[PDB]
């Protein structure tokens, strides 16, 4: 690099005077209450880099934060520690084609849990976060968020999410991905967010949705989730991909596997074992075409064909193949979770239909409910609902006391789970 900075005054001068290709190098020590507004004028071919002289030796404390506010900017080697915020996000991608790497955020917590803020928020396009580490977030708001508008093709890979203390508070996901598909849209668009080759260890947070997809065309690929409460969840949206992940529950209370609402998903080559709950949950969708009883309270949304959206998208047309669910404390595959056979305020009665659920390996602690399919209520007002059959076969259920230890069932593309040595920051803690 080529611009040395020792204090906040010098840093803002360097940000304003750096030209494309420059590097801004921060001196080691503690940087208290520095709001970094990184808006240097870089180029696609010559990015501008803000980084520590020595990775990990620069500690941003107090109310410190970082905002990427112009394209082609790189930030490397920072540590956020001994500090907190009152709102917003510790790190924010407000532009396009920026990169954060080799950065850690460590117990960067406020005093009240109710003082909410993200740790990383995406609000722009084609951004990259990799080899970063996150430990100890204990307040409201997802650790990583993706914003609803103009924030597509962001990628988070080779990061490390560790010891996110458990409190059952919805809104403490590790990842929450908004974007097109939030309102259950089925067009070509989406968030196109990639969560890839990350390691999660005791990343409890809310202990419900570790990853919460609420948009379309996202990729959850090759992550390792160790002993973490909650599951990987497609909550809203369509055409999401959940592939080649490893969920080692280590019998953590509250852990479970994969859960989906919506259509067109590809859930392939996942290895789930020793979770407390279900391996795979296909949740029942909500009927919205008309009110089945006088009690229906629709979720309103302007701009839709009916003026409303379902609480949960019908699970149809998906691919649920070549997964392994071993030693699970709940059902192996739950076809039709959260069924309401007595429609009232909600009409969550659409059983999954036309999905391919084949070539899976399953064992359960109870030795029952390897595959559990909800059967329709006999309620007369649901009598004429007929669901396209799922394609079910070539699933192999093992004796849980005698586990496995060509088109074979179970994970056909076998990779290796991630060690903490290959993810997160290269420097220590």
From TrEMBL:
Its EC number is 4.2.2.3. Pfam families: Chondroitinas_B. CDD domains: PL-6. Keywords: Lyase, Signal. It comes from the Bacteria. SMART domains: PbH1. GO terms for molecular function: poly(beta-D-mannuronate) lyase activity. This is Poly(Beta-D-mannuronate) lyase. It comes from Pseudopedobacter saltans (strain ATCC 51119 / DSM 12145 / JCM 21818 / CCUG 39354 / LMG 10337 / NBRC 100064 / NCIMB 13643).
């Amino acid at each position: 690099g080529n611009i040395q900075v020792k204090n906040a005054s010098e840093l803002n001068k360097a940000i304003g005077s750096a030209v494309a290709g420059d590097a801004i190098l921060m001196q080691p020590g503690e940087w208290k209450d520095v709001k970094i507004l990184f808006n240097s004028k870089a180029s696609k071919a010559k990015p501008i880099t803000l980084k520590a002289d020595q990775a990990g030796k620069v500690m941003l404390s107090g109310e410190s934060s970082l905002s990427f506010d112009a394209p082609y900017l790189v930030v490397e080697g920072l540590l956020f520690k001994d500090g907190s915020l009152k709102k917003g996000s510790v790190i924010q991608f407000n532009s396009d084609y920026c990169k954060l790497e080799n950065t850690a955020i460590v117990d960067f917590n406020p005093s009240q849990k109710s003082t909410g803020y993200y740790w990383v928020l995406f609000r722009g396009n084609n951004n990259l976060m990799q080899y970063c580490s996150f430990k100890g977030k204990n307040n409201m708001q997802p650790l990583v968020g993706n914003d609803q508008d103009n924030s597509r093709y962001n990628t988070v890979q080779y990061c490390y999410f560790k010891d996110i203390p458990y409190t059952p508070d919805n809104g403490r996901e590790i990842f929450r991905i908004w974007g097109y598909g939030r309102s259950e849209e089925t067009g070509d668009d989406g968030a196109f967010f990639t969560i890839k080759n990350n390691l999660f260890e005791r990343a409890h947070g809310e202990g419900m949705e570790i990853i919460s997809l609420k948009s379309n065309r996202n990729k959850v690929i090759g992550n390792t989730v160790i002993s973490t409460k909650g599951g990987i969840v497609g909550r809203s949206g369509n055409f999401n991909t959940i592939e080649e992940n490893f969920i080692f529950g280590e019998n953590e209370k509250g852990s479970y596997g994969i859960r989906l609402a919506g259509q067109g998903h590809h859930v392939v080559n996942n290895y789930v074992r020793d979770v407390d709950g279900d391996g795979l949950i296909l949740i029942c969708g909500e009927y919205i075409e008309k009110a089945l009883t006088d009690k229906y309270e629709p979720i309103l949304r302007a701009g839709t064909p009916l003026g409303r959206v379902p609480r949960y998208g019908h699970v149809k047309d998906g691919l649920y193949v070549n997964n392994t669910f071993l030693n699970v404390g709940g059902a192996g595959i739950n076809i039709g979770g959260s069924y309401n056979g007595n429609p009232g305020a909600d009409q969550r009665m659409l059983l999954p239909e036309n999905n391919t659920i084949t070539h899976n390996i399953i064992s359960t602690k109870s030795g029952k409910n390897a595959i559990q399919a909800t059967s329709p209520s006999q309620n007369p007002i649901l009598a004429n609902f007929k669901f396209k059959s799922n394609i079910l076969g070539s699933n192999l259920v093992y004796d849980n006391g005698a586990e496995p230890d060509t088109s074979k069932p179970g994970v056909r593309i076998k990779n290796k789970p991630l060690s903490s040595k290959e993810v997160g920051v290269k420097w220590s803690i």
